């Protein structure tokens, strides 16, 4: 079968990696690579996040832009804030002048507290530097070990959810059930408008606002936002947020899912 989507391409590339043979199917990949260095500098490091049921793989497309050297055995070391355990480092064997290469870092999602999906990673690329002839590409037999600090990488609940447009929210909401329904009220102390509030939550949760829910009528004090998506693992996750505008914005967030974990993850992340 031939890949026809961006995810299928990624699934193919990841499946070809030896160290990843044990992983189940790819749940999702970030839509756009995030640059981990400033533009026009020595290196170009673009990271893509791949989410699996119980793990995450971080893909780093690296480019060495200096012609008098070559980097080898390149990886990007990661130090997490939360309990994400780094399990494996797959190096880019060689990064000659202007020839992009790829390395990966595999990690386990937090076990103790399944709720700590948010996390910040300190990133440092480790490599072997070898002198190179500016016009032969021939790299010396030996070199030395060096490092290069990169911007931090951020993982959020949005990386654990895939958005989808449900036929009927009313239907899906009843279809899923209320066995694991839960509610929590939060106050957005700094937001003073419903339009902004709705905006921030839609972007933060990475879910799809159904029934034009993201459209807030002119001059109102209350609004109901309806969000839908599929959580890591394949279980549907629905969220209803009833917003109230007073001095600031407050909201009653109710979530539903076929399983309990998704609901607990969402509520614990919004506050």
The CATH topology of the largest domain is given as: Immunoglobulin-like
Name the CATH homologous superfamily of the largest domain. Answer: Coatomer, gamma subunit, appendage domain
State which percent range the strand residues make up.
35-45%
Helix content: 10-25%
Assign the CATH architecture of the largest domain: Sandwich
Distance between the termini: 44 Å
- What overall form do the CA principal axes indicate? elongated
Number of strands: 17
Report the order of strands and helices: HEEEEEEEEEEEEHEHEEEEH
**Pairing-aware structural class of the strands and helices?**
mainly beta
Number of helices: 4
Radius of gyration: 22 Å
Number of domains: 2
Let me know the largest β-sheet. 6 strands, antiparallel
Would you state the CATH class of the largest domain?
Mainly Beta
PDB class: endocytosis/exocytosis
Keywords: platform domain, appendage domain
Assembly: monomeric
Entry title: Structural Identification of a conserved appendage domain in the carboxyl-terminus of the COPI gamma-subunit.
